């Protein structure tokens, strides 16, 4: 039903070709095992021939007679074979791809046209709800998914099933035993892969749980960067982050170990089962004599059919995910729930006017629970008059103008145009009788002529002229070049807004509506153009029944009737003089108011250089990958020798040879492969593991030892940084895993394969490499044309999507409705190009895949053709034919593995490129000296002179300009300002988070500019608004080692004693040893702040800094904290910028700072004697 039928809906002849293509997909999938059925037949005759050839040792010429007769007959069959299958798979290939294109093209084109129509046909609803943009984004991504859902993926699916069910048909028919054995290994092969999913899923979460700690540490630290910097607690986080990395690495190595165990055992069970299939298949030959080895290989082709099932699964997932996502939104996509607007029928009034009548209208905006903006309404405006509406709190007038266009059906009551209800008349016609001028004009991107033409489709420039000329818009446009043909470039901001609105007026003037609606058209406009446009409206007024709402009262002066609302509630109505006579609401208002990343630059081989630099030794892993590489072909060689000697060889010695090769196939693979695979996995696993350690170490430390606008004021974010730590190291880990994987298959194919290739007749080599590279290039150029078409398509739909998003983002088109069908018309014309392009790629994708399979039979042809014929002619041998098959499986594991690890190398290279440029850093400040720390350095009297500053957004209106202060030691320096910054920034600059643009700052009179950064941050009293508490023992939180400072119990005791946090410390379990309980979930702001205070006074700073400490707080907490702050200070210098002016009353020096410029300075009573900003601040404190 709705799931499928609609998904596939319409397409009368399309459904038919869909079935023709489907059928061809069936016979395509059917063809492959038949091709392999042929492989057994050619094997059969050739085997019988070989058995007599070695059985001779007497006669020679007879083998030259009969064996060659049979071989010639088989060549005769061969010719009808490659050809017979080839022409078929070629045609049916072009057809099955025609499914991918011809059907999808018309289906998608129909979907697009209906979707694009229905969206505009929903009208009000989109404004009522959902995303209006994010929605049309995802939706077009879903329709993009549909192309993947209804494409040849289905054709491939049926092809696969044809190879599966059709494969097993032949298998079961030619024997039921071997079937049972393979069916027995099916759950077993499914069993080992089951171990995989359990291991992968389990080990991921462990590593995630491990890195979560590393992530959490990275989470808070990077957020607390200004704090850790100020306290210089970097090296401890350094060590912890190394410990957590140590654990995440140990779970990493165990993961790799188990992984290699799984893949290894899986392949063991595969080759073991394969060998068992042969041992019993042979056992059915030597003594039994049932199979000649046809089905023995064919059942392996049944394994290839199961792999076809594995290729089938994605196609279903491609179909299902396309189905499920589409049909569910399809209910929204199609039809027209509508039923408040529509496009059609209704009643057409010829009375061409109607005294507007509003009767008892109760309405609520579709915000649901929001109260009715308009409760009840009564308004009757006689024809030809101009009624003015007014209000205060906003809207409520705008609602009535909105209702007049029937944009919202009123909850209760009715609005009557003429005598009839408004809901009887055709909506489209109503829209045509209603002109609307909004306060904020909008012009579509087109000629002014076209924007007017959007008012009325059928028009001539003469009417355009009369329109603008009556709208007095005919002046600036003539002076303007291109005249009426002048486009409005880059949306609507080009020329004066008054001119824009005036043009909108000309557009509504062409409409010649019998009702005119003006909403604050004059409002939000410069005075001059206001008077001009107003004059235009006036000439547009008096001629049409209209209703005008604005907050401009001069134009209301000449109105025939005025109606007051103030919130939408109707009270007074009538002429201006009558209203002023009432001295009501009208008179009252008139007179009272009188996250993305990754810059482009790459690595360029610096990768393996730095890697090897950080990779001390691993030659056993890669060498083991080499011996495993050369291990792979031996299997292909042994089996080649098995059937080889089985084909050519006599009845004697068959048992010994077959047994020996069977066992050799066993020990060489099952025993050795597991060993070498687990050995390398254990090597490069730990390699990537320790790389994962050292890299993230040398990154995060390079991150913490540099701040300097990467932290203080980055355009980046915490998440982007954590993301960097994850992705970069994970990617280079895959880079090295790919390194060993590639060298492994490299020697596996090139190295051993060349050696095997060398013993051919040398023509066979050339003919073979006249295929493989050619079909490889054909597949590459296929991939290139593929992406080229995908991209050009993306460009076309890009443009159509842009003008579509343009339409849907502008809902004001519905007020005109003229463009409803016109827009879908332009969209139709826009979509017409990809349509023909869809037809174009029908031929293109069709020939590519066809040719790909055209090379398939052609490959098998020349292989067996030349394998027979000329080779058959002189010295026909059992070898060199199966070695071709070996070279084939090497080209398969080559293309397969290389192409699989190719994109892994890409993203890694890019990710590595980022991680390299970041670690180079710009180390700047760490330790050094700059001073010898003389025994005579204390005081704490801080100087500021002519200091200007801006945080690293340069033209951000620097908060400090021409600033100078002074503070004596042992006393409190108060600070107060308007809002925002300059409060906090002074404190920030004292941290030397950023060195100011000009001027200087002193602490002992020495230059902070020239002072060492570390020792400057060695004495600081910094307290933020909402102190961030690290997850750790609260005792360890209280004491942050400044430099050498050990955790001191008696000290932190004194800290709690002073901070009044000792209350919680006395009682409760674990006391000081109590953990923060998952990010301080157990404490309120007051408690955390108490702890922050303890952190401050632990260090015993000669300088304290309070940034809005008490800003967030209440009741007793404010008093106990204020008490703590006061007992914390007065022993040392402190700076308080706090917004509590109630608590500022005790200060040695209070300073009024005006936006970078210190305005007033002095003691409380002195400034109180003065007057200005400060007194206003206290007066507003109340």
């Amino acid at each position: 039903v709705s799931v499928l039928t609609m998904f596939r809906y319409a397409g009368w002849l399309d459904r038919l070709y869909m079935l023709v293509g489907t059928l061809a997909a069936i016979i395509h999938g059917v063809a492959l095992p038949l091709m392999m059925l042929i492989f057994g037949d050619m094997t059969d005759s050739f085997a019988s021939v070989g058995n007599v050839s070695k059985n001779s040792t007497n006669m020679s010429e007879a083998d030259k007679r009969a064996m060659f007769a049979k071989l010639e007959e088989e060549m005769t069959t061969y010719a009808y074979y490659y050809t017979g299958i080839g022409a078929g798979v070629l045609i049916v290939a072009y057809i099955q791809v025609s499914f991918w294109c011809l059907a999808a093209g018309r289906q998608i084109h129909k979907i697009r046209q209906k979707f694009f129509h229905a969206i505009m046909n929903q009208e009000i609803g989109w404004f009522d709800v959902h995303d209006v943009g994010e929605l049309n984004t995802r939706l077009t991504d879903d329709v993009s998914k549909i192309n993947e859902g209804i494409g040849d993926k289905i054709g491939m699916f049926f092809q696969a099933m044809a190879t599966f069910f059709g494969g097993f048909i032949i298998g079961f028919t030619r024997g039921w035993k071997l079937t049972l054995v393979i069916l027995a290994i099916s759950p077993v092969l499914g069993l080992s892969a089951g171990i995989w999913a359990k291991i992968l899923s389990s080990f991921t979460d462990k590593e995630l749980h491990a890195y979560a700690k590393a992530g959490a540490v990275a989470e808070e630290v990077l957020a607390a960067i200004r704090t850790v910097i100020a306290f210089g607690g970097q090296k401890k986080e350094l060590e912890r982050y190394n410990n957590n990395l140590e654990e995440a690495k140990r779970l990493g190595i165990k993961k790799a170990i188990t992984a290699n165990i799984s893949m290894g055992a899986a392949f063991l069970l595969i080759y073991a089962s394969y060998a068992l299939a042969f041992w019993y298949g042979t056992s059915l030959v030597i003594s039994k004599e049932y199979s000649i080895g046809q089905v023995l290989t064919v059942f392996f082709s049944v394994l290839i059919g199961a792999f076809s099932v594995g290729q089938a699964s994605p196609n279903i997932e491609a179909f299902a995910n396309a189905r499920g996502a589409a049909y569910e939104v399809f209910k929204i996509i199609d039809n027209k729930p509508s039923i408040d607007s529509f496009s059609k029928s209704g009643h057409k009034p010829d009375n061409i006017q109607g005294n507007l009548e509003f009767k008892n209208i109760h309405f609520s905006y579709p915000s649901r629970k929001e109260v009715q903006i308009l409760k009840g309404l009564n308004l009757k405006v006689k024809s030809g008059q101009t009624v003015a509406l007014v209000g205060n709190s906003g809207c409520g007038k705008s609602t009535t103008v909105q209702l007049m266009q029937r944009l919202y059906d009123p909850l209760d009551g009715m609005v009557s145009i003429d005598g009839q209800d408004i809901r009887t008349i055709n909506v489209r016609y109503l829209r045509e009788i209603i002109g609307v001028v909004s306060q904020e004009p909008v012009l579509f991107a087109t000629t002014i002529a076209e924007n007017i033409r959007y008012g009325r489709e059928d028009v001539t420039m003469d009417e355009i002229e009369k329109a603008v000329k009556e709208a007095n818009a005919y002046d600036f446009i003539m002076k303007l070049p291109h005249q009426f043909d002048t486009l409005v470039g880059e949306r609507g901001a080009q020329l004066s807004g008054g001119q824009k609105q005036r043009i909108a007026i000309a557009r509504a003037l062409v409409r010649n509506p019998k009702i005119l609606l003006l909403d604050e058209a004059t409002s939000a406009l410069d005075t001059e153009s206001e008077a001009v446009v107003q004059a235009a409206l006036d000439k547009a007024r008096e001629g049409r029944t209209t209703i005008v709402i604005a907050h401009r009262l001069s134009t209301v002066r000449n109105a025939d009737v005025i109606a007051g609302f103030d919130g939408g509630v109707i009270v007074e109505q009538g002429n201006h003089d009558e209203l002023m006579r009432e001295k009501g609401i009208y008179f009252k208002l008139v007179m009272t108011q009188t996250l993305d990343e990754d810059v482009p630059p790459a690595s360029f081989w610096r990768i393996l250089k730095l890697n090897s630099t950080e990779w001390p030794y691993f030659v056993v892993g890669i060498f083991c990958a080499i011996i495993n590489g050369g291990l792979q072909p031996a299997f292909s060689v042994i089996f080649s020798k098995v059937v080889g000697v089985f084909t050519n060889g006599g009845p004697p010695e068959t048992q010994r040879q077959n047994s020996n090769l069977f066992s050799l196939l066993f020990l060489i693979l099952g025993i050795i492969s597991f060993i070498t695979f687990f050995l390398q996995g254990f090597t490069f696993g730990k390699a990537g593991e320790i790389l994962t350690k050292r890299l993230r170490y040398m990154v995060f430390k390079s991150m913490l030892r540099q701040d300097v606008s990467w932290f203080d004021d980055p355009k980046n974010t915490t998440g982007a940084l954590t993301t960097r730590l994850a992705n970069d190291a994970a990617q280079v880990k895959g880079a090295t895993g790919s390194r060993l994987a590639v060298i492994f298959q490299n020697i596996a194919n090139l190295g051993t394969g060349i050696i095997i290739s060398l013993i051919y007749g040398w023509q066979l080599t050339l003919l073979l490499l006249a295929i493989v590279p050619i079909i490889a290039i054909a597949g590459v150029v296929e991939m290139k044309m593929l992406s080229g078409q995908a991209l050009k398509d993306k460009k076309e739909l890009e443009g159509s999507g842009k003008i579509a998003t343009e339409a849907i983002e502008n809902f004001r088109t519905v007020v005109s409705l003229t463009r409803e069908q016109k827009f879908e018309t332009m969209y139709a014309q826009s979509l017409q190009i990809p349509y023909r392009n869809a037809m174009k790629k029908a031929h293109v994708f069709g020939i590519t895949f066809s040719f790909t399979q055209a090379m398939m039979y052609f490959s098998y042809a020349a292989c067996f053709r030349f394998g027979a014929y000329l080779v058959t002619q002189q010295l026909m041998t059992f070898e060199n034919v199966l070695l071709v098959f070996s070279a084939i499986v090497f080209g398969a594991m080559a293309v397969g593995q290389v192409s699989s690890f190719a994109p892994d190398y890409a993203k890694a290279t890019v990710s590595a490129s980022h991680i390299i440029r970041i670690i180079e850093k710009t180390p700047e400040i760490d330790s050094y000296s700059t001073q010898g720390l003389k025994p005579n350095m204390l005081e704490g009297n801080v100087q500021f002179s002519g200091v200007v500053f801006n945080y690293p957004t340069r033209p951000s209106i620097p908060v400090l300009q021409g600033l100078s202060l002074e503070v004596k030691k042992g006393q409190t320096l108060a600070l107060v300002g308007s809002s925002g910054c300059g409060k906090s920034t002074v404190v920030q600059l004292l941290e030397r988070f950023y060195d100011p643009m000009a001027g200087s700052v002193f602490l002992d009179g020495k230059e902070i500019k020239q002072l060492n950064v570390q020792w400057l941050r060695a004495q600081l009293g910094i307290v933020s608004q909402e102190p961030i508490l690290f997850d750790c023992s609260i005792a360890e939180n209280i004491a942050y080692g400044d430099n050498s400072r050990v955790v001191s119990y008696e000290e932190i005791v004194r800290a709690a004693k002073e901070a009044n946090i000792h209350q919680f410390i006395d009682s409760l379990p674990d006391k000081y040893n109590t953990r923060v309980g998952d990010k301080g979930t157990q404490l309120s702001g007051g408690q955390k702040q108490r702890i922050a205070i303890a952190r401050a006074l632990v260090r015993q700073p000669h300088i304290l800094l309070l940034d809005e400490a008490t800003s967030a707080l209440d009741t007793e907490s404010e008093k106990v904290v204020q008490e703590a702050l006061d007992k914390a200070r007065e022993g040392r210098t402190c700076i308080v910028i706090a917004h509590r002016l109630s608590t500022i009353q005790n200060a040695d020096l209070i300073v009024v700072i005006q936006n970078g410029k210190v305005k007033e300075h002095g003691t409380h009573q002195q400034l109180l004697a003065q007057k200005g900003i400060y007194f206003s601040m206290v007066s507003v404190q109340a």
Partner: nanobody
Amino acid sequence: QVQLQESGGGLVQAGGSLRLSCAASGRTFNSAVMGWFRQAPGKERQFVATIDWSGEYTYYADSVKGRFTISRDNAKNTVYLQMTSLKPEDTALYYCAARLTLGQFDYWGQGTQVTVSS
């Protein structure tokens, strides 16, 4: 393009008449009236009086009404408000302001400070 100046703004004791005037020169004709203000530091701004450039009458505040008077140039744009009997409360900065079609004060001038005693 607009600006409003004041003339006569000075000092006087309780019971004195302080006649003021507001000169308005710029561009506007639709309903731009002339209106005066009064504000004190540490407090919001309060209004005074306003004649309508229509031909109706004036609007006096329930603080200053009965006492204060207002006028026009009669050949040109100005407003002469005679301030009769100013209490020490009156003491404030007075800045004349002009109408806006919108009807929310967008026009302002120079102002003048007035000090009253006993």
